[PDB]
Design a binder for this molecule. Structure first.
Ligand SMILES: COCCOCCOCCOc1ccc(C(C)(C)CC(C)(C)C)cc1
Ligand SMILES: COCCOCCOCCOc1ccc(C(C)(C)CC(C)(C)C)cc1
Ligand SMILES: COCCOCCOCCOc1ccc(C(C)(C)CC(C)(C)C)cc1
Ligand SMILES: COCCOCCOCCOc1ccc(C(C)(C)CC(C)(C)C)cc1
Lengths: 143, 143, 143, 143
């Protein structure tokens, strides 16, 4: 259907494309963060939060994609096709996955308000000229 | 990580293994069932339930896999590899997807109690050898 | 008819006469800013604000100008004339559109008072010669 | 942004498509009307009405387009391209413009109710076959 993975949380794809795709960390970094910070809660038998629910489902989908890529590397013979499939996965699906993981982890960590203000401000910043914007890029911090 | 997509709700992959893989409907059937019963709630900007939160993500994963299948059929010149990939997707990932869709649509339509009692009773029925197995299997119903 | 697009809002062309050309983001940047912050309201059936009204009208004007530029590229056979017209559009009309979009977005974001005080101070700064002004311009930011 | 310039006022492009293109008066006539009736209010420093705001923006866009046409006739030497650009501007853009100006002037002058009723009634008239189409086409009047 026409489902937006962020609108039940108060965001939208138009608001997360408002940031560059070269901004979002790697899938490995984000999954390591998720583990480190919320493993006991994602492996828990509790609806701890919708963020946790969505994050579980996304981690499962990524695991199945990795299984697919390994199965490809094993079975498929044409290296061209194999590399092409694996690259498509890791690039397009990786970008989507890490936008979503960033959103969820960062909301869990800072706040929906904080994260949305950050999106707005960082987009406006990277769109503003340097001479008239602050010189240092915005960054989220618990400290 | 080791995430079970059901223990958040009160089930396990071992409890749903009571049902064989030849049991679950097709993805078309289940997505149509969802579009019939819960479309407006899935397209809604509300955490109506964890079942919705999870079913949305599952539907998005499936949409991305279908997009992948089309992109493959287009951008791959080895029909053998193309067919292999599409078949793997639609078979393995479809089986998992429809396990999950079945669980969610059922616990949304009937409830945890009914669904788990159904799984137990169907395990009884299907572990029972056929000489003593009634024909009237357990069939979820509001009637 | 001797109309000023800001007099209705409490400003003047002579007040924004000082902001340079290098101060305003690109048209794409500003239109994306709008689409991300106020799309649900601009596409709304409500007079949410005079800023919204003006901003809708400006967006439509720019759309018709882009349509013109495309029609030119398609229906003119003198590359010189085509390039000259498209350049004029994107440069002069783009500058005016940037000025206006900036004013409206900035007011909606910060406030009429804040924006007008920023304009006063920025004029004070840009009228001073560099030998006597601070080197870093004033800054309007949410951060 | 998919914006409808009449949706914030209570109309649509499908409701105004009832009226043909050869129905709307000339830009000269409509701007003369606007002057005569609302010059002091359009030149005013007040959000007198959303119609006034929109009308100001439209007049400004038309002025910039006329400036473009003049700049063209001056700089551009290729008569073919010059005439093509000028005629495109006038015909098509002025069609859009006189739609908009008609709507706003008419609403300001008569009423939202009167204008929407006029649109539906002119639809009735123009859909009626000629054998039963009265020659006294509908017309807006305060008498
Ligand atoms: C191939 O079938 C074997 C049986 O699978 C059951 C055991 O695995 C548990 C199911 O786990 C998942 C994992 C991922 C998914 C999602 C929602 C991510 C969808 C999918 C399969 C499209 C990737 C669903 C169920
Ligand atoms: C190539 O990247 C383009 C950027 O598109 C991002 C916006 O598109 C919306 C899609 O949103 C998502 C995000 C994540 C996902 C999940 C979590 C289901 C995982 C994925 C990408 C592995 C299928 C699906 C859709
Ligand atoms: C060529 O005309 C075909 C008619 O198509 C109808 C389209 O829907 C109506 C859109 O109405 C307008 C009216 C004015 C305008 C602006 C304000 C941009 C003015 C213009 C035409 C001077 C650029 C834009 C759209
Ligand atoms: C060439 O740029 C110079 C800077 O502008 C100096 C005058 O500024 C006044 C702004 O005037 C306008 C006029 C029209 C417009 C509209 C909204 C009609 C848009 C446009 C420029 C696309 C025609 C915007 C601003």
């Amino acid at each position: 259907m026409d489902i937006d993975p962020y609108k039940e949380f108060g965001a939208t794809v138009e608001l997360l494309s408002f940031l560059p795709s070269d901004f979002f960390p790697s899938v490995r970094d984000l999954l390591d963060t998720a583990s480190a910070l919320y493993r006991e809660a994602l492996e828990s038998p509790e609806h701890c939060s919708p963020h946790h629910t969505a994050l579980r489902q996304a981690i499962l989908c990524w695991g199945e994609l990795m299984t697919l890529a390994t199965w490809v590397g094993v079975n498929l013979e044409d290296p061209a096709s194999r590399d092409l499939v694996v690259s498509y996965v890791n690039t397009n699906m990786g970008l989507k996955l890490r936008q979503l993981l960033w959103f969820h982890i960062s909301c869990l960590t800072f706040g929906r308000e904080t994260v949305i203000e950050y999106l707005v401000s960082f987009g406006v910043w990277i769109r503003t000229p340097p001479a008239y914007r602050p010189p240092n890029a915005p960054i989220l911090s618990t400290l």
